[PDB]
Amino acid sequence: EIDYKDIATLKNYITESGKIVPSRITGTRAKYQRQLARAIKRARYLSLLPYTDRH
Amino acid sequence: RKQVSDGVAHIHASFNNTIVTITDRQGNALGWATAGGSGFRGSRKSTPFAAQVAAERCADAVKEYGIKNLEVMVKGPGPGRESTIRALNAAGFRITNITDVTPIPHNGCRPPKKRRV
Amino acid sequence: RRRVIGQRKILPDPKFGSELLAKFVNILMVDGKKSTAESIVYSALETLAQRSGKSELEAFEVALENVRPTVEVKSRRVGGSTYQVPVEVRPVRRNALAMRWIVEAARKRGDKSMALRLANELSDAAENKGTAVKKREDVHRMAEANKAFA
Amino acid sequence: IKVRENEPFDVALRRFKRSCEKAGVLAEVRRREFYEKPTTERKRAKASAVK
RNA sequence: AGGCGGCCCCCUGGACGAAGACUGACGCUCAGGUGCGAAAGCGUGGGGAGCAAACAGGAUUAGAUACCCUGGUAGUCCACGCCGUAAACGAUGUCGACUUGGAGGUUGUGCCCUUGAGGCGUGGCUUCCGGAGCUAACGCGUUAAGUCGACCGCCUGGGGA
RNA sequence: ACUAUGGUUUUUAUU
Incomplete structure (x- = not known):
């Protein structure tokens, strides 16, 4: 729900390009989606998940 | 002077022109061609064929370097980003x-x- | 926009063995003068008699293999802009175009007489140069300056 | 926004019209598209996909 | 209401529910006045990659002081001060009562092994028909343009203006 | 489908 110390659970809600997948696809709905987005955006700034993608 | 088998191409196609540059993965360019430099003007300077002839003019490069294996990095929206690779x-x-x-x-x-x- | 038609089928000549003579006498024909057409039909093969090759029965129809049509240009307007496209010639009309290109010099050159104009132009047949070749050569420019059409 | 694919297919596969990329929409729509006007166009038309 | 969508740390406004309870008309509105301003402009210094009102150079053209191409000053960014403007938009003053039916979205609460993002009550927000009524006509229709209770603005043929 | 482009046509008679 908020922590960066596991990415194996966060991988399901992202793409190969590290983009966040919309809640209409993953059954998360907007409320829990907005929590997973915080765990991902923290893991991004700690360089634990890809932020930008070019290739 | 020595054959190294490997290279990388950088292609850009716009609504006015197309650019094709041949490089090594060490960033080093070895030759380049353009659709404007092919002798084309106006609404014709961007065309798939003005770019096709630029690719045939660029495919004469690197013969002494013996390059055959190719990666392509593509840019721009122009119709030239396809005919250049095909040729x-x-x-x-x-x-x-x-x-x-x-x-x-x-x-x-x-x-x-x-x-x- | 709704009248629909076809083409008239024609038979090979009983003497000349070819379908060329069945149509070519209606080409360069004017004022209904079909006996003048039957009087200039291949009459250049006498001005070309030293350059005719074997069998005068085919010695004019062999020239169509060097008239060699490949493309025809169509020009139409879409919106404000007129465009031009070189399209490949159709399986029967390719022969009709060769039959039209072979008479481009027959009057519109300074040589005097149809037969002499035509023999001089049938001797420029391989390279196609100078006068009377515009409609044969300049149509090909458009198909070599562009090979990406739809 | 941009598309991802390991290689570009040898054909464009166009189901939908006025679509960009792959030799489409050439030097067009050069005006501003706007941030809220796309929603105004979804107010002004609601069955544009089926004309 | 103008408006708010890089992220962080600190600070903070208003809104929503169940049940229990306390206080008790403490509730509403309002000429003048006050606080609030997108953008442009202005006070004043700092900034100023990019975008670019002035404009130059080029090109277009009958002309081109505009539309087109290359630049480029102000301005756009910040702090602080002014200016209150609008196709201000959910166009319709503020607050509150009242009326037949359905379905969807969101989120509390109470209930159901929830042992089901799902149900059955029931609130707040929200979306689309629609009964009664209204409206040249479109349209509103429980977040009414309907029917009532309180208060206050704005209007009076076009042009001149 | 979209050419690179153009400004302007005196007045009046079914009572």
């Missing part, structure tokens, strides 16, 4: 990778607006 991959080279590397603002600072006629 180069027929001119002795073999493709292994094609990837789009168009640099994009994501997203700022104010939207573009130009030419109203």
